[PDB]
Amino acid sequence: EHQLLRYLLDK
Amino acid sequence: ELTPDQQTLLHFIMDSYNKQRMPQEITNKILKEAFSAEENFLILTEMATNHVQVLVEFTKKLPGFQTLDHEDQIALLKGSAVEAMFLRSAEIFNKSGHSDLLEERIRNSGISDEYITPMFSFYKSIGELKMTQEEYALLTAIVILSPDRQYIKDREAVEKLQEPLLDVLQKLCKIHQPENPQHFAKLLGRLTELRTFNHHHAEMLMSWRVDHKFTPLLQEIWDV
């Protein structure tokens, strides 16, 4: 889990 | 046999599966770099990175994935990365050696034979199903959209995304292997072998952690 994954999903 | 809606679903999947590129810059390193345990490990680090990169890109475009609870999305991504990745590396391994140089690097990169051997058995076990792209894509999607992963809150929303994929695969099996009615079951049987890599992979990571360094993305995807 975390920020980098959330970023990659959202972009 | 596919319904209009099944076709539509299959095309979205295929559109997204095909945008997945292993970059040339990386395939180039497989020949162009010197061989040592260190160089080989760097190359593999970079390949693993790209595999997970590509997994995220594929995942985010799966129908319904964007409607899922944001924590469940993350649980699925972490839950499936090993299996999704091993599956993709099979596809890349079987479709020039080339393959040969890659094999050589893998076999000299601080990985014990205990893990190398099953990895390569698996590549062979996959290769004699002679799977089409459609089959690889759908399987990958089925692996990713598994309701059985740790930490999922709403397992039903995942199962509803997965089931249709399984229907589409079952029919495709009947269209491309009409003489082998056990094919669908064989594909699903290879998934149980695929799962054994969850345990192998954790062990490979544990022995690599002897001063070795990982990219940010691999650190997040596997909590290390």
Ligand SMILES: Cc1cc(C(=O)O[C@@H]2C[C@H]3CC[C@]2(C)C3(C)C)ccc1N
């Ligand atoms: C954290 C980390 C993980 C891997 C990995 O498991 O992926 C490898 C690349 C391919 C060759 C062996 C792998 C397990 C593969 C089949 C995905 C490789 C390097 C690294 N630094």
